[PDB]
Each structure stands twice: as structure tokens, then as C-alpha cells.
């Protein structure tokens, strides 16, 4: 069981309301890791006990390339401590604005990788609930790592359950049925899909405005508009993906799934296996 003076702190990585990660390395391996720190007697006095546990039990559960890794976890009287794996290059956010936007083989690239941690994560019955760019990391090689695990659901194979009830998410990339039927599916995550491939064509995603409730009146309403050039068949894509019945997205259960997803013509030149192996394009 790991220790705080197991590990020398460097530079702070980001803060949360409630979190604190910081680049460290481990002593006894010289393993680099991103420890993500959160202080006991606030997340008690914030209600956020159950948050910090559903990060820990889903991210445990996952071993797959495309996820930042959650290799331990350990506590002392004050903090709580979870070891992730360092995504070097930051959050994909920050390379759609300072390029502004993705050209179609890195849109088509990061697009791919996204689908394929989103059929792994629905493959284990987990929505993810609150994608988007913030949540991306990019490891040293930029290859995609997505984080944020709190707001998470498993859904239990017992029930065979479906539907999520809890009200977490982003406005930008919430889903219709989380506002108008108040739960969310694995259907959801392909919404915040669609509104992140457009993000990456357009430079902004299509339902923007600056108060919440204004987003979510135009979620509702289906409103939005594409820019006059736009990659036809990532366009396509698009609207097969912002879709207000969630029954009706392409890659959900009821649409039978990724097989159909990965077949659009949009990834007709990509190789699905060893994606994690092949040399990103470099993002220009
Ligand atoms: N595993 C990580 N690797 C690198 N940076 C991270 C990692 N996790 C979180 N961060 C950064 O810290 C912020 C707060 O979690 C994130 O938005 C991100 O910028
Ligand atoms: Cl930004």
C-alpha cells in the first residue's frame, strides 16, 4: 500500500473544484504518474463521497488503451489519493483552439479512436455521461486518454438496465433525453459524439450560447446549423448522430450497434485494429 512519501511531487496539472492532480514520480520504480488528490473533510462537507467512489469502482474496471488508467489508490488522515496514468500533451480542447480546426484525416483519426473507447465503455455496460474535449487527454505519442469517471454510470447486467437516472453532464453536450425525460443511456454518449465531431470541423460545438438554459432550449429544439464548408460525409455523420430519439442514433443498441457506426462512409479508409498502435496525424 502506497504512501504520500513514496512519491516526489512536481508541478501541479490542473484543479477541480474538489481535486487537485499533480505530476509525480514514484520512488522506488521512477514511474511518472498524474495523482489526482482530493482532501477528505471536503468532499464529506460537499456531498461528494459518492462521486469519489463511482470514480474509483469504473475506472477500475477498465483496460483498454484509448482510458487513462487508475493504477492505485491510497488515502492518509486528510487526502484521498488516486494514481493515473500521465496524458502528457493535455486536453484535446486546447489543440481545437489554437488551430481552430481539425483538417478531415486528424478529424477523421481522433474521431475513430473516440468511437473506439466509446464501443469499449458501452461494450462494459458504462455511460460515460459527460464527454467532451476537457475530458480527452492526449499521452506523449497523441493518442486520446479520456478521463472523468465520477459522473460515470455502470449499468447493472443483473436488471438489464437501460436507462440512468442521476442528472450529471455539461450543457454544451448534454444530451435531449437527460432534459426532457430525465435519464440518460449509452445513446447519450453518441449525442456528446456528434457535437464533439462537429466542434472539431466547425471549431465550436452546435449548441452554444452564454447561459445554460439558452443551450438547452436549442438541444430540445434541434437547433443548430452547419458552416458552408464541412466535410460532406463527416456532415452525414453528424446527423446520423444528433438525433433527438436516442433509438435512432447511429452505434446505439437499437440501431444494433458499432458494426454500422464504424461501416459509415466517413471511416471507410480506417483500420479499426491496432488503432492505438498507428502513428497519429500530426494536427496542424
Ligand atoms: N491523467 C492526467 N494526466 C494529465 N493531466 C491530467 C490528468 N488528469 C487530469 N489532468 C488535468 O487536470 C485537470 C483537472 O482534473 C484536467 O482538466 C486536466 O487538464
Ligand atoms: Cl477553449
Not at 505519442?141 to 455539461?170: C, W, Y
Not at 433525453?177 to 452546435?206: F, R
Not at 447511429?250 to 498502435?277: D, I, R
Request: charged residues 30%; proline residues 5%; glycine residues 6%.
Amino acid at each position: 500500500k502506497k504512501r504520500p512519501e513514496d512519491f516526489k511531487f512536481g508541478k501541479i496539472l490542473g484543479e477541480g473544484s474538489f481535486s487537485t492532480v499533480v505530476l509525480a514520480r514514484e520512488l522506488a520504480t521512477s514511474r511518472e504518474y498524474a495523482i489526482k488528490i482530493l482532501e477528505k473533510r471536503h468532499i464529506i462537507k460537499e456531498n461528494k463521497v459518492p462521486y469519489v467512489t463511482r470514480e474509483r469502482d469504473v475506472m477500475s474496471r477498465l483496460d483498454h488503451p484509448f482510458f487513462v488508467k487508475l493504477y492505485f489508490t491510497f488515502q492518509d488522515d486528510e487526502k484521498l489519493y488516486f494514481g493515473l496514468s500521465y496524458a502528457k500533451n493535455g486536453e484535446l480542447l486546447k489543440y481545437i483552439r489554437k488551430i481552430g480546426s481539425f483538417d478531415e484525416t486528424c478529424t477523421r483519426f481522433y474521431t475513430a479512436e473516440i468511437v473506439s473507447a466509446l464501443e469499449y465503455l458501452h461494450g462494459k455496460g458504462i455511460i460515460h455521461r459527460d464527454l467532451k474535449p476537457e475530458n480527452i487527454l492526449l499521452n506523449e505519442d497523441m493518442h486520446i486518454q479520456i478521463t472523468d469517471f465520477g459522473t460515470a454510470k455502470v449499468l447493472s447486467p443483473e436488471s438489464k438496465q437501460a436507462r440512468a437516472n442521476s442528472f450529471v453532464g455539461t450543457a454544451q453536450y448534454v444530451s435531449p433525453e437527460l432534459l426532457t425525460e430525465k435519464s440518460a443511456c449509452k445513446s447519450s454518449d453518441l449525442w456528446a459524439l456528434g457535437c464533439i465531431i462537429y466542434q472539431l470541423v466547425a471549431g465550436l460545438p452546435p449548441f452554444r450560447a452564454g447561459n445554460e438554459g439558452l443551450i438547452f432550449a436549442k438541444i430540445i429544439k434541434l437547433e443548430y446549423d452547419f458552416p458552408e464548408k464541412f466535410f460532406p460525409k463527416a456532415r452525414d455523420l453528424v446527423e446520423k448522430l444528433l438525433v433527438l430519439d436516442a433509438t435512432k442514433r447511429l452505434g446505439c443498441e437499437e440501431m444494433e450497434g458499432y458494426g454500422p457506426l464504424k461501416a459509415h462512409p466517413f471511416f471507410e479508409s480506417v483500420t479499426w485494429e491496432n488503432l492505438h498502435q498507428q502513428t497519429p496525424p500530426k494536427l496542424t
